[PDB]
């Protein structure tokens, strides 16, 4: 439910509010970062039609789209790596109702961005013989921006039961300042269900990269926002 955006340093970013109601009289905007407490960045007053900011932020940093009838948008300028985080809209109905929010990552250099490779590993026969349960492993490797979203689809349907995804990626080169990432996920089902050859399993990684607005000048492909995938079918042995 949370949108995601990756941007270069010094460029602008747009974030749309995901709230039950589109247009509220006062709409607040908060930032959350991993190490520190969330803080209110600003809020928008519809009556005065202006943003009320905090004393620690420049006035030429953020602004609003505020499309009528639609959810409001917040635009950020001259992005720096310390602007990476997650941004939540907020409103006062019962308590401070936070929106779904949007995750944002920004990079100084656009040269070191890569999309991930997705591989699917089939369950071991030993685990089927021992526990009567089958575990399928998805490995995604070689993505520098840790802004991926992994999911599993059986018979083309998103599954939330029996799925585990690692919460922190790991670096191939721990001694590198700018190192690439790898992530793993597991889906466990009854061995009878896996042994059915009709059942189709797919691991899908939504990778958040660049847009068509951005330009690319490399010999390589363009790491645009995309969906990488891998799949397998049941084996009855």
């Amino acid at each position: 439910r949370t949108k995601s955006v990756t941007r270069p340093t010094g460029s602008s970013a747009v974030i749309t509010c995901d709230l039950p109601v589109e247009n509220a009289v006062y709409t607040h905007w908060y930032l959350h970062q991993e190490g520190k407490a969330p803080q209110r960045l600003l809020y928008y007053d519809s009556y005065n039609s202006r943003v009320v900011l905090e004393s620690g932020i420049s006035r030429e940093k953020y602004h609003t789209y505020a499309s009528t009838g639609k959810s409001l948008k917040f635009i950020l300028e001259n992005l720096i790596e310390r602007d990476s985080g997650v941004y939540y809209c907020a409103t006062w109905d019962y308590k401070k109702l936070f929106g779904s929010g949007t995750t944002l990552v920004v990079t100084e250099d656009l040269k070191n961005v890569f999309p991930p490779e997705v591989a699917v590993f089939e369950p071991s026969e030993a685990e089927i013989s021992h526990t009567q349960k089958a575990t399928l492993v998805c490995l995604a490797t070689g993505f520098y921006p840790d802004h991926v979203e992994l999911s599993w689809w059986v018979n083309g349907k998103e599954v939330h039961s029996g799925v585990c995804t690692d919460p922190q990626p790991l670096k191939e080169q721990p001694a590198l300042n700018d190192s690439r990432y790898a992530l793993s996920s597991r889906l466990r089902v009854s061995a009878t269900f896996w042994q059915n050859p009709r059942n189709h399993f797919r691991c899908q990684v939504q990778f958040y990269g660049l847009s068509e607005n951005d330009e690319w000048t490399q010999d390589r492909a363009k790491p645009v926002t995309q969906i990488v995938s891998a799949e397998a079918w049941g084996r009855a042995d």
């Binding site: 949370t2 006062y26 959350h32 030993a126 029996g162 466990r188």
Partner: protein, 212 residues
């Protein structure tokens, strides 16, 4: 006004009681205090609200959440008596600053206390299988699973092999949850038997033979 969460990050069991410590200093005589949480899916949800004289909780608490608000010590603690694995999250406490109009008010949060609810494996079956790779990739995958939460995963001995950490897999259909950890490498001398040699392994860990 300042809000501090002195409690460090804690790992509890699926049946313990969890206490989260939050202390506030404000000029207000009857401040509005709040407990919120951020889930791993980054969902920002309201848990509890407490003033000096009353409290109101979220619908999802179902009596499992309560608040210890003691005025003399200026303390606003959060207690989860039946703590489940579904509540593993980073919890924050906040206060409301009156700034003109009620809908213009700001919330000031604490740095955050993180709660990890490990599961209770009734019948541990620690096993290290070798999942055969799809011909799309050459890497070999070793899976360590069905171990108890007390066993702690240690990182790889060398950078040649990559080992993730503990993860919780819940089968809702069978109501059974297990623990899992993956380890992969492309080295020619890579074996699942020697994969987790850097971690404290249970003496009764299954080591299936490759010739199965």
């Amino acid at each position: 006004d300042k809000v501090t969460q002195s409690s460090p990050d804690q790992t509890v069991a699926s049946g313990s009681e969890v206490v989260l410590l939050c202390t506030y200093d404000t000029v207000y005589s009857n401040p509005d205090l709040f407990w919120y949480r951020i889930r791993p899916d980054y969902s920002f949800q309201f848990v509890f609200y407490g003033d000096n004289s009353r409290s109101e909780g979220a619908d999802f608490t179902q009596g499992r959440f309560s608040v210890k608000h003691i005025l003399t010590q200026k303390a606003f603690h959060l207690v989860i008596s039946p703590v489940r694995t579904e509540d593993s999250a980073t919890y924050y406490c906040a206060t409301r600053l009156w700034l003109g109009d009620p809908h213009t008010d700001k919330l000031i949060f604490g740095k955050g206390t993180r709660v990890t609810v490990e599961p209770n494996i009734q019948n541990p079956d620690p096993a290290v299988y070798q999942l055969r790779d799809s011909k799309s990739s050459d890497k070999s995958v070793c899976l360590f699973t069905d171990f108890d939460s007390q066993t702690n995963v240690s990182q790889s001995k060398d950078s040649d092999v990559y080992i993730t950490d503990k993860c919780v897999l819940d089968m809702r259909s069978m109501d059974f949850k297990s623990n899992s950890a993956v380890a992969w490498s492309n080295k020619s001398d890579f074996a699942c038997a020697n994969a987790f040699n850097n971690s404290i392994i249970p003496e009764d860990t299954f080591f299936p033979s490759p010739e199965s």
